C-alpha cells in the first residue's frame, strides 16, 4: 500500500463498475457510504471515480469521515464537508506488521495549518514550534515533522495496521462516464410480450423477419413513424415488431 502522509490517487475512468462485489464481500471491516447508500451504486453513473489508498492505525479509521479532527484528518488526509463517495477499510495485521517493528509506515504530526480537502503535502522541512528560527537543524522547538508507526504483530487491536480505500465519485460537467452493469434475458418470439432492446421499450408479438438492414442499422420504422422491426444485439437477426393484438 501507500503511506498515510503521501496517499495514492488512482483515477478510475470509463468502464463497468460493479460495487456489489465490493459491498457483499464481507471481508471489509468498515464500509460507509455518505453521499449515497451502498445498494444504489450499481444503478447510477458519474463522470469520474477517484480511489485513494493508504494505511493507518486501527482506531484512526474514525477520522476518515466528513467533519472530523485529529492528527490524521488535520494534516494527513482531509475529506470535504459534502463528501459523496464511500470509505472502505479492512484489517491487515498479517501483511504490514513484522516482528521487530515495521518502521516504513510514517505519518505527519506537525504542520502549520490544517489541510484543504484533498490536499497533499510531501515536504520534509524542519518544523518550528517556538519563535526561534531553526536553520535546518534539530533541537528544542525544532522538530522533524514525520513519525513512524512501529507496527508489531503482538499489538492489541486498535494498534494493528488497517488498510483504507476512499472512493470519491465526482460529477463535473461532461457528457457521461462509468456506470454500473446492465441486465439481460432470453428472447421469446411469437407472443405479445413486453420487451426492451438496449433502450427500445415496447410491447407486442415478435416474429422472425425476412428483411435485410444495413450492417449498422438497429431498428426499422414505418411511414407515420412507428417502430416495426428490431435487430437482436446478441445474435444480430431482424425481428418484426408487429403491434399487439386488438380490436
Amino acid at each position, epitope marked *: 500500500f501507500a503511506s498515510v502522509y503521501a496517499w495514492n490517487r488512482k483515477r478510475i475512468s470509463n468502464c463497468v463498475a460493479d460495487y456489489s462485489v465490493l459491498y457483499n464481500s464481507a471481508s471489509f471491516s468498515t464500509f460507509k457510504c455518505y453521499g449515497v447508500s451502498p445498494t444504489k451504486l450499481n444503478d447510477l453513473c458519474f463522470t469520474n471515480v477517484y480511489a485513494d489508498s493508504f494505511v493507518i492505525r486501527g482506531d484512526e479509521v474514525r477520522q476518515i469521515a466528513p467533519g472530523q479532527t*485529529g492528527k490524521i484528518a488535520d494534516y494527513n488526509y482531509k475529506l470535504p464537508d459534502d463528501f459523496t463517495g464511500c470509505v472502505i477499510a479492512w484489517n491487515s495485521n498479517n501483511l504490514d506488521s513484522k516482528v521487530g517493528g515495521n518502521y516504513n509506515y510514517l505519518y505527519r*504530526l506537525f504542520r502549520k495549518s490544517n489541510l484543504k480537502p484533498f490536499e497533499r503535502d510531501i515536504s520534509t522541512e524542519i518544523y518550528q514550534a517556538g519563535s526561534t528560527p531553526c536553520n535546518g*537543524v*534539530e*533541537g528544542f522547538n525544532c*522538530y*522533524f515533522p514525520l*513519525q513512524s508507526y512501529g507496527f508489531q504483530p503482538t499489538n492489541g487491536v486498535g494498534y494493528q495496521p488497517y488498510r483504507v480505500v476512499v472512493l470519491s465519485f465526482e460529477l463535473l460537467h461532461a457528457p457521461a462516464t462509468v456506470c454500473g452493469p446492465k441486465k439481460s434475458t432470453n428472447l421469446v418470439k411469437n407472443k405479445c410480450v413486453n420487451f426492451n432492446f438496449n433502450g427500445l421499450t415496447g410491447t407486442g408479438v415478435l416474429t422472425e423477419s425476412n428483411k435485410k438492414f444495413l450492417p449498422f442499422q438497429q431498428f426499422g420504422r414505418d411511414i407515420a413513424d412507428t417502430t416495426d422491426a428490431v435487430r437482436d444485439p446478441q445474435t444480430l437477426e431482424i425481428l418484426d415488431i408487429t403491434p399487439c393484438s386488438f380490436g
Partner: antibody
Amino acid sequence: TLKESGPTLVKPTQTLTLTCTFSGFSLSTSGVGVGWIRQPPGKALEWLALIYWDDDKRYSPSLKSRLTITKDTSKNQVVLTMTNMDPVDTATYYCAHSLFLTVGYSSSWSPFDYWGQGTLVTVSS
Amino acid sequence: DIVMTQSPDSLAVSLGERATINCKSSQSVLYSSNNKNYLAWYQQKPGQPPKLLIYWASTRESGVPDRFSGSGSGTDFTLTISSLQAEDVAVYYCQQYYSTPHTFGQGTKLEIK
C-alpha cells in the same frame, strides 16, 4: 545500555573528564542524544550536560563555565570534562539517553529513557 | 515552574495489592498538541537509579509488567499499579519537561504490608 565510568573519590578544583560508556545505539541521527545527571545524597537529581546527534550541546547555566561535554558515537561513549570541584558537588554522576525530543514534555530533563548507572564522586582530600 | 507533589509517602501496601501514587502538577502540564499526556514514571531502587516505567503516561516501557499502568488528567496524575510484589520496595518519581527547571516528585517509602 549506558554506563557511567569514572573515578570514585576526587580532590578539589581540577578539571575532570567523565565517561558514559554505552552500546546498543549510535548517537548521530536526527532525534538522538544523551543527558548527563548528578544527585547529591538526599537531594532530588540534577541534570548537568547534554549533546544531540549533530552535536547540539546543552549544559546547566550555573556550571556552564565548568561543564564541557562531547559525544563519542564511535566508542559508544560521551566525554564530559568538568572543572572546579567543591564538596557540595559530592554526587553520583549519571548519563541518560535522549530519544525524540518531540516526546519532551514529561521529565524536566531529570531523566530521559535509557539511563546507565552512574560513577560515584566524593570530594575528600 | 510546575511542582510535582507525590501521593502516598510511607506506603504500607500489602503484597500483590494495588499500590497507588498520585502526582499533582501545580499547573496543567498538558501539551494540548498531542491529545495524549507525556508523563514519565520512575522507580529508584535503593542504591540504584530510577528507571523509566511508563512514558506517555499510558505507554509502558519494554520488559515491564503491565500490572503497572499509568493514568491521570489535567493536574491530577495517578498510577494504577494493580499488584505490589516483593520486588517493589523502592522510591518513585514524577516530573515534566513542560517546565523550565528540574521539577521532581519527592519519593515514597514502599513498606510491604
